Enzyme design. Structure first.
Site, mmCIF file in Angstrom:
data_model
loop_
_atom_site.group_PDB
_atom_site.id
_atom_site.type_symbol
_atom_site.label_atom_id
_atom_site.label_comp_id
_atom_site.label_asym_id
_atom_site.label_seq_id
_atom_site.Cartn_x
_atom_site.Cartn_y
_atom_site.Cartn_z
ATOM 1 N N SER A 170 0.893 -0.979 -0.370
ATOM 2 C CA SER A 170 -0.205 -0.022 -0.382
ATOM 3 C C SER A 170 1.113 1.252 0.679
ATOM 4 C CB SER A 170 -1.201 -0.099 0.984
ATOM 5 O OG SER A 170 -1.690 1.659 1.774
ATOM 6 N N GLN B 77 -0.398 8.208 6.674
ATOM 7 C CA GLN B 77 -1.765 8.379 6.720
ATOM 8 C C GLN B 77 -1.920 9.206 7.656
ATOM 9 O OE1 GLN B 77 -5.039 5.718 6.220
ATOM 10 N NE2 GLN B 77 -5.031 6.422 4.168
ATOM 11 N N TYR C 30 -1.621 -1.114 10.614
ATOM 12 C CA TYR C 30 -2.077 -1.056 9.287
ATOM 13 C C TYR C 30 -0.645 -0.725 8.212
ATOM 14 C CZ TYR C 30 -3.460 -1.363 3.615
ATOM 15 O OH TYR C 30 -3.318 -1.923 2.656
#
Lengths: 259, 260
Positions: A140, A147, A153
């Site tokens: 990702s 983020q 994640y």
């Protein structure tokens, strides 16, 4: 363009929906044999994959169960004679922020998102080495860019970039290629349902999409799959250790870019 | 895999030999129409390209002549109705080290290796924008990693990575994709000739190739071409701004890696 993957077996984790399913369909439509490792398989997707590949199989699997992975990978190799490629793709962005997530729940997230990339690759490697095949890790943008509210994640995705480089080193001598694809914003049915939670779904989409330089629109599943299957194939036979971004310019172009 | 490039015109500079020629052949094999801009075209290569595409054309061009570039790009567009893609590839590593190369000779190197990437792209851009096409800059590992005795080439290749990012920004709104491929060590007849100048060509090859993790062997022209043509095609329709390394692991894997 002949990708030269006819009858080559590729195991795809999380391959029953979204990006993984797009890779599965394209693998099959190019003559490969996809083998889906997921918790469940929609009946309509089972029907379509069977139409595209008479030898396709779905294996119901809990990817948090290492012993089940060992047993099921061996069954795949026995059934088909071997394994050419593995796509590690199962997982979701669970938005676990460090300030209100325990270390125990970080580890539970890793059980869902991270550890099975290792277990699956370990168990497939003897077979993939024999066929001088390919390992593809779906990661990702968030592992590169961060983020801000998704420590679990983000770190899992970056860890898998590390696996990509490490396994590329480990198995280059064996002529096994190991690469990764870092999607940014990819339209999927699950993303569409998430956008429908919002008071104005089209407005929320445009809010996200306006930051994507190429077209102010999400990447498609097909675009990810096209680069994935090309990269897995022998036509990418000197590509290894790569983190590939088919992402509309999300990672690399000036953040201030606009219309 | 249907690349959806049937009858799409791609101009390839330096496309008569080596990497450029491999891209031209594959472009034509997949249904596209390659147009070669180079100083000369081998007779056998002209024959092979015509066999692959009846509409392939060779234009003899001095890429240091900006007006001739303008005139010949216009001729291509008139003849074919437009231009879908441009591969900037002409140039050589001329191994011009800073300590014994004047700035004037740096600039002469840029005339050979750098400035025509700008001129070609400038002149092709109206046509490529109309077709929502692709620009591909062939660069080199040396623009990322350096080498040590080739200031002119290294800086020109890095400049072209800058053009890649800048043009990706400029034309994303036009749905024009701009990418680059950075080869490392690619076996070509020119490379084979360079190796043949050594008393021990095989050992010189192995000295270089031992540093390539994937197989201890050079990248092939076909490997570069496959990634180039896939990236040019509509199948890579969200890929822009990328510097792509099909390179055996040369740039990214541990420098200490060996087979021990």
């Amino acid at each position: 363009m002949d990708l030269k993957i006819k009858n080559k077996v590729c195991i795809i984790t999380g391959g029953a929906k979204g990006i993984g399913y797009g890779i599965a369909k394209l693998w099959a439509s190019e003559g490969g044999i996809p083998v889906i490792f997921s918790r469940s398989m929609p009946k309509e997707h089972d029907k379509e994959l069977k139409k595209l590949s008479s030898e396709y199989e779905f294996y119901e699997i809990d990817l948090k169960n290492y012993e089940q992975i060992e047993k099921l990978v061996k069954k795949v190799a026995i059934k088909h004679g071997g394994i050419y490629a593995l796509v590690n793709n199962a997982g979701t962005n669970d938005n676990l922020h460090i300030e209100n997530t325990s270390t125990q729940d970080l580890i539970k997230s890793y059980e869902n998102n991270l550890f099975h990339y290792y277990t699956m690759t370990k168990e497939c490697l003897p077979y993939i080495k024999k066929e001088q095949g390919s390992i593809l890790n779906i990661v990702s943008k968030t592992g590169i860019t961060g983020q801000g509210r998704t420590s679990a994640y983000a770190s899992a995705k970056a860890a898998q970039m590390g696996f990509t480089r490490e396994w590329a080193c480990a198995f280059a001598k064996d002529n096994v290629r190991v690469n990764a694809i870092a999607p940014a914003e990819v339209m999927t049915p699950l993303y569409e349902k998430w956008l429908q939670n919002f008071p104005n779904p089209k407005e929320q989409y445009e809010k996200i999409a306006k930051a994507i330089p190429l077209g102010h629109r999400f990447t498609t599943i097909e675009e990810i799959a096209n680069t994935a299957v090309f990269t897995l194939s022998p036509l990418a036979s000197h590509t290894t250790g790569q983190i590939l971004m088919p992402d509309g310019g999300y990672v690399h172009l000036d953040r201030a870019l606009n219309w």
